[PDB]
Structure formats: C-alpha cells, structure tokens
Amino acid sequence: QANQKRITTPYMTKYERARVLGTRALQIAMCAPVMVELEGETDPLLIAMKELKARKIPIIIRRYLPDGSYEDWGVDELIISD
Amino acid sequence: KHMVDDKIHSRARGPIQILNRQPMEGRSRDGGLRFGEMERDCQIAHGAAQFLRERLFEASDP
Amino acid sequence: AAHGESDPMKGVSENIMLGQLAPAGTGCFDLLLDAEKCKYGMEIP
Amino acid sequence: ANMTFAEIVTPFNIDRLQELVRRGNSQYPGAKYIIRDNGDRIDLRFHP
Amino acid sequence: RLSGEAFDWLLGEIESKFNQAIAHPGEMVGALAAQSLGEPATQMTLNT
RNA sequence: UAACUAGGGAACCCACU
C-alpha cells in the first residue's frame, strides 16, 4: 500500500499528538538536536509543542490497520488537530 | 474528631510489602494509595495507556 | 490449561496484567524516527 | 516536599537543578535523589 | 441573507467543524460507553 | 575518623464516601 493506498485519516488524532509530544520532549530532554529555532526555553515539553506547531518533529507514526497492514505517516504529512 | 493533620499523607518509594513487592497499606506504615480497578477503567477511558503503564507497572512494582 | 489454550494478548487486560503497553490509544500505533528530517535540524549549543 | 519528579539534567536546566541539589532535601524546592548515568541513586537527605 | 464572502467562510467553517467531529481512531469507545451508562446508574432510583 | 534501612498475617468492630 503506497501513497495511493493511504486510507487512514489525514488529521493527527489526539492520541497521536499526545504521544508524539511526549516522546519528542523526552528526546529533547535527552539532548537531542532541536529542529526549530527556539526563543529560549528550559521546558522540553514547550519546545516539543513549538516543534509540533512548526510541523518539524522528525517522527513517522506507524498506524496499524486492524487486518495486519500498517501505514507510515509523517508528522509533517499529518494535518495537526489544533 | 476528623482533623486534617490526622488524614494528610503522601508517599514516594517508601516501605514495600514482602508477599508481593507492592507498597504498604495505610499512612501509619507509610503506605501508598490504591490505584484500583475503577481507576484502571477510567484511564482506559482517557486512553492514557502510558500513564496506566506508569501507574500499574513502573511506579508501583517494576 | 486443561485444553492447552493460548492468549494472543491483543486485548487490554492481558497487557495490563503482563505490565506491557496496552493497545488503547496512545499505544494503538507505533512511532518511527524519521531519517531525512533529522538531517534538517541544527544542534543546540 | 515529599513527592518528587525525576527531571533529566540538560544544559538548559543544569544551573537551576545544580542550585536545587545544593539546597538539598528539606530546603523545600530542592531534591532528595540524584540518579547517576548507570542508574546509581545518591541520597540528598543524608548529606554526602 | 448572507453575502458571498460570508458564505465562503460558512462553508469552510462547516467543513472544519465536521472534520473535527470525526471519531478518533484509537478511542477507547467501550469503556467510555460503559461509564456513560453506569454513571447515570447511581443517580437513578427505584423509589424516587 | 561517619559503621545507612525499614519487616508478618487473619478475623472482627468502628468511622469516611
């Protein structure tokens, strides 16, 4: 199933954004390079919110279809919820 | 008779039972609160499966 | 046990009893670290 | 002053967390455990 | 009596607020409905 | 020249919600 057969919803759900911010801010707190030009923060969770609004989180969500298949959506491909 | 100094307690990785390695019961033995079945159901309803893993596995008895 | 049954553990209670991460939303999916987009980010000082 | 959050030392917060460890435990905003890179716990309530 | 730009804004708003109301894949619907039925169970009374 | 951890259970009763 290529990008033609890409059948899940284009909107990033609340669960996907809730886990993406968590595991991105956990990486930022473990001294990952930050993708965005931060204006000065110490909270990694606020920096991950900056990267989520910048659509620059380097994470692909593997959405498991219930038959066994899986799609791979980029965060920048997903329309953010808010 | 119900005073708030008699009822306040917190807990963080204190004494642990010997039969299973879960925290103690009651504030007199520095025990922790019970994260019962209905809270497990409520955190299923939130969909906080990482918080539910953190409660039921990591911050209780890893 | 008498019938030799198995448990595929796709449910919620099975993963909670075994203490691993449930497939319940924040957990229904999996996350892949992107290879190309990590080139595009700068190292913080 | 009895429930703790495990905050990871990064260069953004290393001065703040350094000051909270210098306060030690019971100088309220400080800390009680400091966990090494190999998972070794160091108390701050017993004044090393 | 809407105007043309008001009507374009209206269609965009209807399309947005419908796409926000789609059920999210991953939502624990079962526990949600069981709580949605058992929480009015305590408020109901045979003798009221 | 600072020796650094904790230990039980089972029943009943009462109280809080």
Side-chain angles (χ1 to χ4, degrees):
Chain A
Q1 294 179 357
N3 52 3
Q4 280 71 239
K5 297 291 184 182
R6 182 68 65 80
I7 61 169
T8 58
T9 62
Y11 293 93
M12 179 182 285
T13 64
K14 60 193 288 184
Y15 303 100
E16 292 176 354
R17 66 179 295 163
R19 189 173 174 185
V20 160
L21 291 177
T23 190
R24 176 59 185 165
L26 179 58
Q27 290 179 359
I28 290 171
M30 290 180 180
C31 296
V34 52
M35 302 291 109
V36 75
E37 291 290 327
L38 56 90
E39 296 292 327
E41 289 88 2
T42 63
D43 192 3
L45 211 159
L46 293 173
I47 298 169
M49 182 65 79
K50 296 288 179 65
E51 294 182 355
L52 186 68
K53 297 297 181 182
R55 294 171 66 93
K56 290 185 182 294
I57 297 176
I59 284 173
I60 298 170
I61 300 170
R62 176 176 286 170
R63 291 183 171 184
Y64 289 107
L65 269 294
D67 58 354
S69 176
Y70 64 94
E71 298 184 356
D72 288 331
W73 284 87
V75 165
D76 57 354
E77 299 176 356
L78 290 167
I79 294 172
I80 58 171
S81 178
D82 295 333
Chain B
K1 71 180 291 293
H2 299 89
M3 295 183 284
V4 70
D5 286 332
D6 295 335
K7 292 183 182 294
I8 183 173
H9 69 90
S10 64
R11 192 258 171 77
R13 64 177 67 251
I16 289 172
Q17 297 182 2
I18 60 166
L19 177 58
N20 48 359
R21 272 76 170 272
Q22 290 182 0
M24 298 300 297
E25 294 188 353
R27 66 184 297 281
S28 65
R29 296 179 296 175
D30 198 2
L33 299 174
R34 188 171 181 271
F35 188 83
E37 297 88 3
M38 297 184 289
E39 289 85 4
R40 192 262 302 165
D41 301 333
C42 182
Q43 294 306 111
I44 289 170
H46 285 285
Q50 286 171 349
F51 181 72
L52 191 61
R53 182 181 177 180
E54 191 270 334
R55 291 291 96 191
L56 293 175
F57 169 71
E58 184 68 28
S60 178
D61 50 359
Chain C
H3 290 289
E5 296 182 355
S6 178
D7 193 1
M9 295 181 66
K10 298 285 103 174
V12 185
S13 168
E14 293 84 357
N15 295 112
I16 288 167
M17 289 175 72
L18 267 298
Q20 61 191 359
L21 194 275
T26 310
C28 186
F29 56 93
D30 197 359
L31 293 90
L32 301 178
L33 184 69
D34 187 80
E36 292 90 4
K37 299 286 104 174
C38 290
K39 294 179 183 178
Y40 290 162
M42 67 291 292
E43 179 67 32
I44 197 68
Chain D
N2 207 163
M3 289 169 68
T4 60
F5 184 76
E7 187 175 2
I8 299 170
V9 173
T10 201
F12 290 156
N13 61 8
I14 190 168
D15 196 2
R16 180 175 60 83
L17 291 174
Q18 185 67 256
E19 192 271 332
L20 278 330
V21 172
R22 297 287 173 81
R23 291 180 64 87
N25 196 358
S26 175
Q27 295 293 106
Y28 160 72
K32 58 175 69 175
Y33 286 99
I34 166 172
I35 297 172
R36 298 289 184 89
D37 290 331
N38 53 3
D40 292 330
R41 294 187 185 274
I42 299 299
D43 290 331
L44 298 177
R45 69 182 76 188
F46 292 152
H47 303 286
Chain E
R1 292 186 179 94
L2 287 172
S3 67
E5 60 186 3
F7 189 77
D8 295 335
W9 181 79
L10 182 62
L11 300 182
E13 184 69 27
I14 293 168
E15 194 265 332
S16 175
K17 300 294 287 296
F18 184 77
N19 289 321
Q20 294 182 358
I22 308 299
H24 290 87
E27 185 181 2
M28 275 292 167
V29 150
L32 178 54
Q35 292 173 356
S36 293
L37 292 171
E39 192 269 330
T42 305
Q43 283 75 241
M44 289 188 289
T45 305
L46 70 158
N47 289 114
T48 284

